[PDB]
Design an enzyme around this catalytic site. Sequence first.
Site, PDB file in Angstrom:
ATOM      1  N   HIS A   3       0.681  -1.301  -0.148  1.00  0.00           N
ATOM      2  CA  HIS A   3       0.012   0.025   0.024  1.00  0.00           C
ATOM      3  C   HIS A   3       0.865   1.358  -0.024  1.00  0.00           C
ATOM      4  O   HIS A   3       0.527   2.318   0.776  1.00  0.00           O
ATOM      5  CB  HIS A   3      -1.101  -0.167   1.135  1.00  0.00           C
ATOM      6  CG  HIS A   3      -2.034  -1.017   0.914  1.00  0.00           C
ATOM      7  ND1 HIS A   3      -1.921  -2.303   1.515  1.00  0.00           N
ATOM      8  CD2 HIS A   3      -3.267  -1.212   0.310  1.00  0.00           C
ATOM      9  CE1 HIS A   3      -2.785  -3.255   1.302  1.00  0.00           C
ATOM     10  NE2 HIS A   3      -3.624  -2.379   0.535  1.00  0.00           N
ATOM     11  N   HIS A  26       1.415   1.856  -5.861  1.00  0.00           N
ATOM     12  CA  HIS A  26      -0.061   1.371  -6.029  1.00  0.00           C
ATOM     13  C   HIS A  26      -0.868   2.279  -6.242  1.00  0.00           C
ATOM     14  O   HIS A  26      -1.935   2.250  -7.334  1.00  0.00           O
ATOM     15  CB  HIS A  26      -0.395   0.544  -4.813  1.00  0.00           C
ATOM     16  CG  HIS A  26      -2.026   0.006  -4.717  1.00  0.00           C
ATOM     17  ND1 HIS A  26      -2.306  -0.774  -5.803  1.00  0.00           N
ATOM     18  CD2 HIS A  26      -2.909   0.301  -4.083  1.00  0.00           C
ATOM     19  CE1 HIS A  26      -3.795  -0.929  -5.612  1.00  0.00           C
ATOM     20  NE2 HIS A  26      -4.069  -0.246  -4.643  1.00  0.00           N
ATOM     21  N   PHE A  57      -8.464 -16.028  -4.785  1.00  0.00           N
ATOM     22  CA  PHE A  57      -8.702 -14.482  -5.062  1.00  0.00           C
ATOM     23  C   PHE A  57      -9.274 -14.407  -6.354  1.00  0.00           C
ATOM     24  O   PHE A  57     -10.407 -13.351  -6.561  1.00  0.00           O
ATOM     25  CB  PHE A  57      -7.311 -13.857  -4.722  1.00  0.00           C
ATOM     26  CG  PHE A  57      -7.723 -12.327  -4.919  1.00  0.00           C
ATOM     27  CD1 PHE A  57      -8.513 -11.677  -4.058  1.00  0.00           C
ATOM     28  CD2 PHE A  57      -6.817 -11.585  -5.859  1.00  0.00           C
ATOM     29  CE1 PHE A  57      -8.655 -10.332  -4.313  1.00  0.00           C
ATOM     30  CE2 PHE A  57      -6.871 -10.038  -5.740  1.00  0.00           C
ATOM     31  CZ  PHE A  57      -7.874  -9.537  -5.080  1.00  0.00           C
ATOM     32  N   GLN A  89      -3.971 -16.837  -4.657  1.00  0.00           N
ATOM     33  CA  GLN A  89      -4.415 -16.170  -5.682  1.00  0.00           C
ATOM     34  C   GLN A  89      -5.388 -16.896  -6.671  1.00  0.00           C
ATOM     35  O   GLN A  89      -6.300 -16.223  -7.235  1.00  0.00           O
ATOM     36  CB  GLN A  89      -3.219 -15.907  -6.781  1.00  0.00           C
ATOM     37  CG  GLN A  89      -2.135 -14.933  -6.258  1.00  0.00           C
ATOM     38  CD  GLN A  89      -2.644 -14.013  -5.219  1.00  0.00           C
ATOM     39  OE1 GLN A  89      -3.459 -13.241  -5.583  1.00  0.00           O
ATOM     40  NE2 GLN A  89      -1.942 -13.860  -3.969  1.00  0.00           N
ATOM     41  N   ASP A 116      -8.811  -1.130  -8.581  1.00  0.00           N
ATOM     42  CA  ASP A 116      -7.836  -1.484  -7.340  1.00  0.00           C
ATOM     43  C   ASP A 116      -7.657  -3.043  -7.222  1.00  0.00           C
ATOM     44  O   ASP A 116      -6.735  -3.556  -6.634  1.00  0.00           O
ATOM     45  CB  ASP A 116      -8.894  -1.308  -6.193  1.00  0.00           C
ATOM     46  CG  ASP A 116      -8.074  -0.980  -4.846  1.00  0.00           C
ATOM     47  OD1 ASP A 116      -8.726  -1.200  -3.968  1.00  0.00           O
ATOM     48  OD2 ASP A 116      -7.111  -0.285  -4.746  1.00  0.00           O
ATOM     49  N   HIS A 119      -6.785   7.425  -3.065  1.00  0.00           N
ATOM     50  CA  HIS A 119      -7.414   6.141  -2.515  1.00  0.00           C
ATOM     51  C   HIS A 119      -7.016   5.396  -1.355  1.00  0.00           C
ATOM     52  O   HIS A 119      -7.750   4.791  -0.841  1.00  0.00           O
ATOM     53  CB  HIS A 119      -7.970   5.424  -3.815  1.00  0.00           C
ATOM     54  CG  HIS A 119      -7.214   4.192  -4.016  1.00  0.00           C
ATOM     55  ND1 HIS A 119      -5.969   4.316  -4.379  1.00  0.00           N
ATOM     56  CD2 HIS A 119      -7.553   2.939  -3.895  1.00  0.00           C
ATOM     57  CE1 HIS A 119      -5.474   3.118  -4.581  1.00  0.00           C
ATOM     58  NE2 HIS A 119      -6.232   2.222  -3.966  1.00  0.00           N
ATOM     59  N   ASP A 120      -5.647   5.460  -1.119  1.00  0.00           N
ATOM     60  CA  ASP A 120      -5.037   4.674  -0.077  1.00  0.00           C
ATOM     61  C   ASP A 120      -3.831   5.468   0.513  1.00  0.00           C
ATOM     62  O   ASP A 120      -2.839   4.889   1.144  1.00  0.00           O
ATOM     63  CB  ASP A 120      -4.516   3.373  -0.480  1.00  0.00           C
ATOM     64  CG  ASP A 120      -5.241   2.013  -0.646  1.00  0.00           C
ATOM     65  OD1 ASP A 120      -6.326   2.173  -0.171  1.00  0.00           O
ATOM     66  OD2 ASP A 120      -4.909   1.169  -1.443  1.00  0.00           O
TER      67      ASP A 120
END
Length: 323
Positions: free
Chosen positions: A72, A76, A284, A281, A230, A112-113
């Site tokens: 983060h 990113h 995910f 993954q 995202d 956004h982060d």
Amino acid sequence: EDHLAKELEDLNKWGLNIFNVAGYSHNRPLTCIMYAIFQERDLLKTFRISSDTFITYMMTLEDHYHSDVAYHNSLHAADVAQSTHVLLSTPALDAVFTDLEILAAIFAAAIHDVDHPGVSNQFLINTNSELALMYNDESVLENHHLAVGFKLLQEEHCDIFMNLTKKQRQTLRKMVIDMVLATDMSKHMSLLADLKTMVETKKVTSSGVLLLDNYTDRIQVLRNMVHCADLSNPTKSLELYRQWTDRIMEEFFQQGDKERERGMEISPMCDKHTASVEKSQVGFIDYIVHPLWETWADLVQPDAQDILDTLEDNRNWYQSMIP
Ligand SMILES: CCOC(=O)c1c(C)nn(-c2ccccc2Cl)c1C
Ligand SMILES: [Mg+2]
Ligand SMILES: [Zn+2]
């Protein structure tokens, strides 16, 4: 050096290698790309944003993304910012969004982060962090990212929206808050559901361009666009994707270590002694990424067909990596 310039020729492409531009920009991917995107989209001219002012803000903002956090970080923000910029150019959404809404979406992806501490909303809540307390356990991190992003605009040398009307500033503030709040995973299953209802009643035109009624329909497709941006790591080329996985497992495992020290109950995907990076993954992609991108692809078909194929290939490589 001029290696940077070579890479920014892929600015409008999904193939951009954001790690490369990070390497040729004195480790400042976010500033770089944001500047490249606003020049490309003529946003500095349209909104009379001083060039000098825009750089200082972006650098300050990029400085608040913790460089010692595995995933983060500023890399990113730059990546989501760029992907959003590409998804915004997709053929099905041509001339659908006003220049205020385009500015809002990219600006949103960039902040956004901001100031992410490297732990989840759930962790901060169970440890009674000042932040959970502050925000009453509801979308803690995202409320904060929005708080910092806008606190940085309360200054003359940093306020990029200085030449937006009263209505233009409020109309953007409203949209940005909505986009960043939608990036909270806990809202994912409901988001995908409302995206499926949009596809059900989708009405294009003669040129294969979606017709969006009012704000309700435009901001809904923007919320999902930033959300997809995202969750875009598994749709990128395998080389870029595997590196992202390495970075998110680094951040997750450090949160797992932090949890073990404090004596809490250690989550499964955060435990470095039982978690499979490879099965993490596969799952995910099957339950989160593919269902979302399968729906987005349906919304803009056949524009996102190449991405959908890349996602299945990426998924299968990770599946064969498990014995
Ligand atoms: C690159 C591979 O991605 C993931 O595995 C992953 C998982 C699992 N959770 N997250 C994540 C972490 C924080 C915020 C949002 C998301 Cl989707 C990510 C990026
Ligand atoms: Mg986030
Ligand atoms: Zn993010």
